[PDB]
Design a protein around this ligand. Structure first.
Ligand SMILES: C[C@H](CCC(=O)NCCC[N+](C)(C)C[C@H](O)CS(=O)(=O)O)[C@H]1CC[C@H]2[C@@H]3[C@H](O)C[C@@H]4C[C@H](O)CC[C@]4(C)[C@H]3C[C@H](O)[C@]12C
Ligand SMILES: C[C@H](CCC(=O)NCCC[N+](C)(C)C[C@H](O)CS(=O)(=O)O)[C@H]1CC[C@H]2[C@@H]3[C@H](O)C[C@@H]4C[C@H](O)CC[C@]4(C)[C@H]3C[C@H](O)[C@]12C
Ligand SMILES: [Mg+2]
Ligand SMILES: [Zn+2]
Ligand SMILES: [Zn+2]
Lengths: 50, 1347, 555
């Protein structure tokens, strides 16, 4: 029951760096520039109610 | 031994030797072979006296004549053995040692006495760090601590003219070397020069402290013990238990430890060990003594051979087991007993039954006296053998001792002062205390095995008090309201409600009777039923003449039932009281009218006659319950099918995506509760009028005799809810989370309950249990906390002699009048005379006890407000005058002189508190007059618009409803500028709307009618491009601060009103020209280019839960400021804005001319309900929300805050439907707002910003301004009870309920010569209480003193 | 500062938690004793929790105490404890930390420490042989002892048979008398012979303390006389240090350097005139001390100075060694941590024992001082744990018997299988079969009279031990009734009858008399008394006169 800490500290101490932390706790949304101004990938489920 | 005030102070060492009887020296206690005490250890013979009465230790001297001579062989003063209980011996602590209380009390006594922080004191004590003690004048400050190496160098620095120690020797040197008059002069100096309010604040505080510590008889070094007294031998015994095992107290252990360590330190000193050794030893002795005193504040107790920390001297005084709370208030009591109570209806209400055997065990001394009086046993031993044989004649002698000897009967928790009533006895076979039946409502005692205890009053004053004050038939009026507490409860009312009803065609229909007497002669012989409607010739005695009783025969049209009830009703009552159904409410107001008309004797004898006849005809009814009695509605299956189809609708619509899950859940629960109410109504209408029977004709329907319906109608038990659960379905069990389950119980108790449904019932059932388990274990916390604050308060003057009371009127919360005036001016005594509306008169003198005759007059003349004298403005010094408390009591006359009203007040507020939900609990745009009656407007500021309608330009115009009587029949609170229709004081018609306004949006309607333009409205800076742009509505609405520039914040959004040319007409009365300025979000619609009409919405400005538990009352009396404090005016004058938005925008209000500059900082996240151009009255609603009672008290005045508290807590009760008269809350408030503050002392001698209590400062300036001198301004305070009880003139009192240690130590340093004359004080020290009968005795001692 | 944020949150929120406080606390202390102190302070502060669980309902609902003037001091104690340093708590840890500043080895540096100790004892030994009253005290003790007023083996604790000692007493007697019988031709040779004949003897430490105390009293006399000289000359006459020590040094015997100094035509000489007699008395006591001893006061000072310096060296060596061996004491004392006594009490007993070990060590048997003092430490702590541990104190042999019984009880309770009976202990042990009953009756502790007998509302064993010696109110009423009855009975006699029958008993008077005093009253210490007493006894034996008395018979 000692002091609090940033909970990511245990994950970094588990031989995890930031990239694989983010890719453990998140899905992905890509952004591209295909000949014009920042195209986007779009799965239909992503953008519900926004 | 009628001594005096008790006195407390420091324990000077030579005083501690005068207490001594010889130094304890050795740790032995007893001798392990002969269990005499070794000399001399914690125990002794020569120190603390002899073991056996009048017998030496070695045994040389063993006769009463030799008392006093100390045996030459073992020096034991041959005297009594109770002298073993009063002798204190001392210890000669080799090195000194610091008393833990004057070290770790919290605010260190030594800390703020030496002007030194605590950590350095712990340094010098535990040898962390050296410290100077009068280091002379070379380099070092007096308090200047050091460390090891620094002292080592400084010895080379100043080996001479230098003085540095460490240990208790150091603190003692400092305290002794201190000179207090020097520090008083120095502190008065820096009070002179150092002109910094914080600085000279703490400066003058410490000088207050030192002058106090000087004006005691104390000395500063007495806080550091050199000599430490041992408790005697017999307060910490070493009892020989059976088997050689001894069961000693713990102080023997602690003193053994301390004596060991003292001897060991002396032994170390003789050798002169290296300094690590002696230092660790002195630390060990310090910890030992500090564990002796408190065994806490040191960090970790020193537990004995158990794992349980061993108790110590600061712990045999403290706690709910210390001597204060556990053996000075709760003490066992000889001459008592107990048993299982029982029913016993054959008793008048002034005699409790009682067993022969409890009687012959309680009254043995009385029996013995009588038996040596009648010569049935020459000596007392013979009388004992007799009454222990249970012979023939001791029963006769016991009946001669139990003739008029009232036993006190108590129940387990004695909440309210009817909890302890006396009775006479009536000797009885058995072992159940056959209690009376009526009194059980008062005790709150069913007969499920509850055990009442009987005491016995020994003396003769106590017998006259157990007869003239505590007899059963002198407490029938509940102390918390005048209504009798002898309400007939369950079998008696069912008996009457069966007796006085009427079935349509019983025997003996319509036949006339010659009176009540042959009504009984018909019923008993059987010629006619108990109830069948019948003409009789009653003869009621109305007593309208002055005390007369004018007979008047007649032929009332009644039943036989009512008539046979009439033979028991006494004279003065009128026959229309027993001609009705006689439910429970009516059968109790029967007794109420009896007490209000005929006094007390006929009401007592009449309550007994009612119980007798009630039981008799309740038994004759055979009012049984059977399983054909609970009729199910035959229209139940349809209703359940219909609702279970509506849930099909919502299920289909949920799986069409039309409603969320929350919505379908709410709708389901809504249609089930609707089906529930419909099924319950259907059963109740199949149940009430169900019986259909037939008088000599076709048919006819009447109220039914379904046994469960009479049991639900009378008020005997239950109601329509329990009748619901027995016949209709039973609702929706609510799971203990608070969320209500959605699967209702479509079955009931006459049908079964399959497994799921019963189980779902289990949730709410066990929540009810788990709360009424915590309520019975924490039931009296509120009464406890109130009698702590409101206890020493005693009605100790006949007439305070004032003219200042609080104005009483009937409460009206925007509707039907909640509480009329005859329930509020019933008992209280008028303040200023009352004038009939033409003044016509002098209706009532100012000192008339308003009993019901005067309420008769006041209600015959339609008086609206009666400025009645009140407890919170009585002008008495340490008391409350006779009149101003009023009259209310278990009796009906004026309150006697002395009768301790603080306690019965706290109990009037605390015994119904059992009858309230313990969890807190939340209940949750046009005006419509009810009926005929004129309109009445207060604070109305209206304008005669060119439109015609009426609009109020005052923030606080109350819309009342007056009739041609003049009474206030209704009142409503108009918002600002509501569109008003009818006249101001004129007439309207019933049920007709008269006021409409804007629900959410605030009009800014103009003052007079003149041309319009704009000023300082630049878009982007002060205004924005708003418009209902489909309509053309150019709206350049005022910009807020986050959208106005940083110079825009310096801009003034405005609405100028031009006259016919371009100038600005003066505002009528004032000289501010015609225009309105506006804040942010002052949404503008129209623009420059129109002449306004009065009632022009120049802008559009947008925008209750009543906790009802007991904790709402706890927090009301605690007076905690709420979360959102109602911001409130401060100076009666014009309003304005301040330094714009420094996080919290600053208001500014200004009077006509006086001290204007008041600006207030407000969290601008909250609405400001004030105009930008108005004159806010002092004590006016700038904002909304609950307003803090402190602000009421400081802005408005006393009577405002007292009416606030009483109406708030009265809301909390009469929500639940509990009656409690307002004397009690007003007296608890008078104990709340007791302290005071000062503004300008002036011709008195109190510190300006000091807090002193009202009585003291008021007598001070009353006697001074009585002289030629000038008074002293005081700003009244208002403390919560938990803090307003926290200050007490006595310390013996405050050593009970406060934490004992702080009380004792503060009084100790202050040398506070505590008088007696409280009630905690005298109940502790065991002399006469100065409250009730003891008051004349204390007046006796007052006369003795001061002469 | 953040702990002050804990303070403000405890103020607002109305409580805290172990997690909250453990969050805000100042890092790096975590002893859990400072923690318990600070938690008690936050309790004593406005916050009144300390919590675990957040709430809390109608069960003791809406509680609070203002407690003004405690918050400002408690928050102050917090902000001061955090900012400055982390303070130590308790006293065992005090002792640990305070002795941890001891350089914890003397690997054969004990030899140098004992060297310093021998230096001190030998310098003070030269003081011994040189102090005249030492030898006079020895000779006086010898005479007192020989007559039989004291023992020879009580005075001196052996040299390096009391007749050997006695002939040596006569040898040193002749040495001292020949030293004294030459009053300045061979005085140094005389003192040499005396010292070299007395410097292989020895005495009891308390006899040496008596020697040193007469020596200290000699020093106190000389210091009081030097006060009478200098505090009456310098500090009474403005006769400063230089102008006083010009004549106060070197010879320091004659009255001349004061009286003739009065005549040296100086201000101090013009102020010493009324202190002349007082300093004359001072130098007269000084020369009477001279008369006493034989050596100048300056030799007095030099001798006591050498003694004091040797004593200081020896005490300092003792201190240094004990500071070293405190670790040994702690290690050896850890082994009794539940004997019925405190850890610190054990280690303090060990301190005393280690001091005695230091005082009774010698390298002249080749010991290793660590293991040497281990025995003394364990013995002293054993003596203490026996003597002052039990509540009611049992003696040492009794504690030895008790631990014998416990050892044999353990041996039998796994030899015989179940457990032994007293009849079996009285044959494994060889006690009289009844001492074992008394021993195993006695050797048990007492029960704590605040023991929680929790079988009730909330009670204690102390609240259930009734009082046995109180007289019943029935008894007191019977006593008063019997007094009244017998008084009326005795009134139902004659004056002489009643007087004799009160006196020969203790009725309505002090303790009861003898026939000697009965006769000293009624003139006849003879059968008149017997006649009256027995005849009145017969008269009151009359039924119809003592029926009520015999009704007072509890048979
Ligand atoms: C621990 C227990 C609390 C309840 C669980 C308390 C309550 C009653 C106490 C005993 C009695 O005194 C009787 C007996 C007296 C002997 O002489 C000494 C031993 C005995 C066995 C006591 C030990 C202990 O103190 C007892 C068991
Ligand atoms: C039955 C009761 C518990 C009820 C649950 C137990 C708990 C402690 C017991 C007492 C102790 O033994 C001490 C003492 C010993 C004497 O010798 C006899 C009397 C005493 C008062 C005992 C009576 C009884 O036995 C007690 C009250
Ligand atoms: Mg019950
Ligand atoms: Zn004696
Ligand atoms: Zn009054």
């Amino acid at each position: 029951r000692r002091r609090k800490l940033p909970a990511t500290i245990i994950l970094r101490a588990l031989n995890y760096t930031t990239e694989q932390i983010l890719d453990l706790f998140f899905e992905k949304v890509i952004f591209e520039i295909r000949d014009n101004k920042l195209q986007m990938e779009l799965v239909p489920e992503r953008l519900r109610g926004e | 031994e009628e001594f005096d005030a008790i006195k407390i102070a420091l324990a000077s060492p030579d005083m501690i030797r005068s207490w001594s009887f010889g130094e304890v020296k050795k740790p032995e206690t007893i001798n392990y072979r002969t269990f005499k005490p070794e000399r001399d250890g914690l125990f002794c013979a020569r120190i603390f006296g002899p073991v056996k009465d009048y017998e030496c230790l070695c045994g040389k001297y063993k006769r009463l004549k030799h008392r006093g001579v100390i045996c030459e062989k073992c020096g034991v003063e041959v005297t009594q053995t109770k002298v073993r209980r009063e002798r204190m011996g001392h210890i000669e602590l080799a090195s000194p040692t610091a008393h833990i209380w004057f070290l770790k009390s919290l605010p260190s006594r030594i800390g703020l006495l030496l002007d030194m922080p605590l950590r350095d004191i712990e340094r010098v004590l535990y040898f962390e760090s050296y410290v100077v003690i009068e280091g002379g004048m070379t380099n070092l400050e007096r308090q200047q601590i050091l460390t090891e190496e620094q002292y080592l160098d400084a010895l080379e620095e100043f080996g001479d003219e230098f003085d540095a120690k460490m240990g208790a020797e150091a603190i003692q040197a400092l305290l002794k070397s201190m000179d207090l008059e020097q520090e008083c002069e120095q502190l008065r100096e820096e009070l002179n020069e150092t002109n910094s309010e914080t600085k000279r604040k703490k400066l003058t505080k410490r000088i207050k402290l030192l002058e106090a510590f000087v004006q005691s008889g104390n000395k500063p070094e007495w806080m550091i013990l050199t000599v430490l007294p041992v408790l005697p031998p017999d307060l910490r015994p070493l009892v020989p238990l059976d088997g050689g095992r001894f069961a000693t107290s713990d102080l023997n252990d602690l003193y053994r430890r301390v004596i060991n360590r003292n001897n060991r330190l002396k032994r170390l000193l003789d050798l002169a060990a290296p300094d690590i050794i002696v230092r660790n030893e002195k630390r060990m002795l310090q910890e030992a003594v500090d564990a002796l005193l408190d065994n806490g504040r040191r960090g970790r107790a020193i537990t004995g051979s158990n794992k349980r920390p061993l108790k110590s001297l600061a712990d045999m005084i403290k706690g709910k087991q210390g001597r204060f709370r556990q053996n000075l208030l709760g003490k066992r009591v000889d001459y008592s007993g107990r048993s299982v109570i029982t029913v016993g209806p054959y008793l008048r209400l002034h005699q409790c039954g009682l067993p022969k055997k409890m009687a012959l065990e309680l009254f043995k001394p009385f029996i013995y006296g009588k038996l040596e009086l009648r010569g049935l046993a020459t000596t007392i031993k013979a009388a004992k053998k007799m009454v222990e044989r249970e012979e023939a004649v001791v029963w006769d002698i016991l009946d001669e001792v139990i003739r008029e000897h009232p036993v006190l009967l108590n129940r387990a928790p004695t909440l309210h002062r009817l909890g302890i009533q006396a009775f006479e006895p009536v000797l009885i076979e058995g072992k159940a205390i056959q209690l009376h039946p009526l009194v059980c409502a008062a005790y709150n005692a069913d007969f499920d095995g509850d055990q009442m205890a009987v005491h016995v009053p020994l003396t003769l004053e106590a017998q006259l008090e157990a007869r003239a004050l505590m007899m059963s038939t002198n407490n029938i009026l509940s102390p918390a309201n005048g209504e009798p507490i002898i309400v007939p409860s369950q079998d008696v009312v069912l008996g009457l409600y069966y007796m006085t009803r009427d079935c349509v065609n019983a025997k003996g229909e319509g036949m006339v009777l010659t009176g009540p007497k042959e009504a009984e002669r018909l019923y008993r012989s059987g010629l006619a039923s108990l109830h069948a409607r019948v003409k009789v010739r009653i003869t009621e005695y109305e007593k309208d003449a002055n005390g007369e009783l004018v007979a008047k025969t007649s032929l009332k049209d009644t039943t036989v039932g009512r008539a046979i009830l009439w033979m028991i009703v006494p004279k003065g009552l009128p026959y229309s009281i027993v001609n009705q159904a006689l439910g429970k409410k009516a059968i109790s107001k029967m007794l109420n009218t009896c007490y209000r008309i005929l006094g007390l004797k006929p009401t007592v004898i009449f309550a007994d006659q009612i119980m007798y006849t009630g039981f008799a005809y309740a038994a004759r009814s055979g009012a049984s319950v059977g399983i054909d009695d609970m009729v199910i509605p035959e229209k139940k299956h349809e209703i359940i099918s219909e609702a279970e189809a509506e849930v099909a609708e919502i299920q289909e619509q949920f799986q069409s995506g039309l409603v969320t899950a929350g919505e379908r859940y709410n709708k389901v629960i809504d249609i089930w509760a609707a089906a529930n109410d419909r099924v319950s109504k259907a059963m109740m209408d199949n149940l009430q009028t169900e019986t259909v029977i037939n008088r000599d004709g076709q048919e006819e329907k009447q109220v039914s005799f379904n046994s469960i319906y009479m049991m639900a109608d009378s008020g005997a038990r239950g109601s329509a809810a329990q009748i619901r659960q027995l016949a209709g379905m039973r609702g929706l069990m609510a799971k203990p989370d608070g969320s209500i389950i959605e699967t209702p119980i479509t079955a009931n108790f006459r049908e079964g309950l399959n497994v799921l449904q019963y189980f779902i019932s289990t949730h709410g059932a066990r929540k009810g249990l788990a709360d009424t388990a915590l309520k019975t274990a924490n039931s009296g916390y509120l009464t406890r906390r109130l009698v702590d604050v409101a206890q020493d308060l005693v009605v100790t003057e006949d007439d305070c002699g004032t003219h200042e009371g609080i104005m009483m009127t009937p409460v009206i919360e925007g509707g039907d009048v909640k509480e009329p005036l005859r329930d509020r001016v019933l008992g209280r005594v008028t303040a200023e005379d009352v004038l009939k509306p033409g003044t016509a008169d002098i209706l009532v003198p100012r000192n008339t006890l308003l009993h019901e005759q005067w309420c008769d007059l006041l209600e015959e003349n339609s008086v609206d407000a009666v400025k009645v004298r009140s407890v919170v403005s009585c002008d008495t010094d340490f008391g409350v005058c006779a009149h101003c408390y009023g009259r209310d009591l278990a009796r009906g006359h004026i309150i006697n002189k002395g009768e301790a009203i603080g306690v019965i007040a706290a109990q009037s507020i605390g015994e119904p508190g059992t009858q309230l939900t313990m969890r807190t609990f939340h209940i949750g745009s046009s005006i419509q007059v009810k009926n005929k009656g004129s309109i009445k407007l207060s604070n109305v500021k209206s304008v005669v618009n060119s439109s015609g309608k009426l609009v109020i330009t005052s923030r606080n115009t109350e819309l009342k409803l007056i009739d041609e009587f003049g009474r206030t029949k209704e009142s409503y609170k108009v918002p600002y500028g509501a569109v008003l229709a009818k006249g101001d004081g004129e007439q309207v018609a019933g049920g007709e709307t008269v006021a409409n306004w804007d629900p959410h949006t605030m009009p800014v309607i103009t003052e007079v009618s003149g041309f319009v333009r704009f000023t300082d409205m630049i878009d982007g800076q002060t205004i924005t491009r708003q418009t209902d742009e489909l309509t053309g509505l150019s709206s350049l609405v005022v910009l807020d601060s986050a959208e106005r520039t940083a110079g825009g914040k310096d801009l003034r959004p405005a609405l100028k009103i031009v006259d016919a040319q371009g100038n600005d007409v003066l505002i009528p009365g004032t000289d501010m020209p015609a225009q309105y300025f506006l804040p942010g979000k002052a949404i503008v619609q129209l623009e420059d280019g129109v002449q306004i009409s009065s009632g022009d919405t120049l802008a559009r400005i947008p925008q209750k839960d009543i906790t009802g538990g007991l904790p709402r009352v706890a927090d009301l009396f605690e007076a905690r400021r709420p979360k959102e404090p109602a911001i409130l005016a401060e100076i009666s004058g014009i309003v304005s804005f301040g330094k714009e938005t420094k996080g919290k925008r600053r208001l500014v209000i200004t009077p006509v001319d006086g001290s204007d500059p008041y600006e207030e900082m407000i969290p601008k996240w909250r609405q400001l309900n004030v105009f930008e151009g108005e004159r806010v009255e002092r004590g006016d609603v700038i904002s909304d929300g609950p307003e803090a009672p402190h602000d009421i008290l400081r802005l408005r005045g006393v009577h405002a805050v007292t009416r606030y508290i009483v109406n708030e807590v009265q809301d909390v009760y009469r929500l639940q439907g509990v009656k409690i008269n307002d004397k009690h809350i007003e007296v608890i408030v008078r104990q709340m707002l007791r302290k005071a503050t000062i503004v300008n002392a002036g011709s008195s001698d109190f510190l300006e910003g000091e807090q002193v209590e009202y009585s003291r400062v008021k007598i001070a300036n009353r006697e001074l301004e009585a002289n030629g001198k000038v008074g002293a301004t005081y700003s009244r305070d208002l403390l919560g009870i938990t803090k307003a009880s926290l200050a007490t003139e006595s310390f013996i009192s405050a050593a009970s309920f406060q934490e004992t240690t702080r009380v004792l130590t503060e009084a100790a340093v202050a040398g506070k010569r505590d008088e007696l004359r409280g009630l905690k004080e005298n109940v502790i020290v065991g002399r006469l209480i100065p409250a009730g009968t003891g008051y004349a005795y204390h007046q006796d001692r007052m006369r003795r003193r001061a002469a | 500062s953040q702990l002050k944020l804990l303070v403000t949150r405890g103020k607002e929120q109305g409580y805290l938690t172990y997690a909250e406080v453990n969050d805000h606390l100042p890092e790096d202390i975590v002893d859990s004793d400072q923690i318990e102190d600070i938690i008690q302070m936050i309790n004593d502060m406005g916050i009144q929790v300390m919590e675990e669980a957040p709430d809390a309902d109608d069960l003791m609902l809406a509680e609070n105490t203002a407690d003004e003037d405690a918050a400002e001091a408690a928050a102050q104690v917090l902000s001061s404890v955090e900012s400055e340093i982390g303070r130590t708590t308790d006293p065992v840890r005090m002792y640990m930390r305070e002795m941890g500043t001891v350089e914890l080895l003397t690997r054969e540096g004990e030899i140098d420490i004992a060297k310093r100790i021998e230096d001190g004892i030998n310098q003070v030994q030269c003081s011994v042989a040189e102090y005249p009253e030492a030898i006079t005290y020895l000779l006086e003790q010898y005479d007192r002892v020989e007559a039989e007023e004291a023992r020879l083996s009580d005075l001196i604790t052996g040299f390096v048979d009391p007749e050997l000692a006695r002939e040596k007493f006569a040898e040193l007697r002749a040495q001292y008398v020949v030293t004294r019988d030459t009053i300045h031709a061979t005085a140094q040779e005389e003192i040499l012979k005396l010292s070299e004949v007395f410097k292989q003897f020895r005495l009891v430490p308390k006899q040496f303390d008596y020697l040193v105390n007469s020596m200290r009293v000699m020093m106190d006399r000389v210091r009081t006389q030097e006060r009478l000289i200098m505090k009456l000359c310098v500090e009474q006459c403005k006769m400063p240090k230089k102008n006083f020590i010009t004549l106060f040094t070197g010879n320091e015997t004659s009255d001349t350097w004061f009286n003739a100094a009065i005549a040296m035509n100086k201000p101090w000489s013009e102020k010493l005139h009324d202190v002349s007699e007082e300093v004359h008395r001072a130098l007269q006591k000084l020369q009477q001390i001279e008369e006493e001893t034989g050596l100048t006061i300056e030799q007095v000072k030099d001798i006591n100075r050498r003694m004091s310096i040797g004593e200081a060296k020896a005490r300092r060596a003792k201190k240094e060694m004990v500071e070293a061996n405190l670790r040994l004491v702690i290690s050896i004392a850890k082994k009794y941590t539940n004997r019925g006594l405190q850890f610190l009490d054990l280690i303090q007993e060990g301190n005393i024992g280690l001091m005695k070990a230091v005082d009774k060590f010698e390298y002249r048997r080749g010991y290793k001082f660590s293991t040497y003092a281990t025995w003394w430490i364990r013995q002293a702590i054993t003596r203490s744990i026996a003597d002052q541990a039990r509540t009611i104190r049992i003696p040492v042999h009794m504690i030895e018997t008790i631990n014998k019984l416990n050892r044999i009880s353990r041996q039998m309770l796994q030899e015989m299988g179940r457990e032994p009976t007293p009849e079996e202990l009285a044959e494994r042990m060889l006690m009289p079969e009844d001492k074992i009953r008394k021993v195993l009756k006695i050797a048990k502790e007492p029960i704590s009279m605040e023991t929680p007998i929790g079988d009730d509302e909330d009670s204690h064993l102390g609240d259930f031990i009734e009082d046995t010696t109180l007289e019943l109110p029935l008894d007191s009423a019977t006593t008063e009734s019997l007094r009244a009855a017998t008084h009326d009975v005795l009134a139902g006699l004659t004056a002489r009858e009643a007087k004799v029958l009160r006196m020969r008993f203790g009725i309505d008077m002090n303790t009861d008399y003898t026939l000697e005093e009965v006769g000293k009253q009624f003139d006849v210490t003879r059968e008149r008394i017997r006649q009256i007493e027995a005849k009145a006894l017969r008269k009151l034996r009359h039924p119809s006169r003592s029926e009520v008395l015999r009704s007072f018979l509890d048979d």
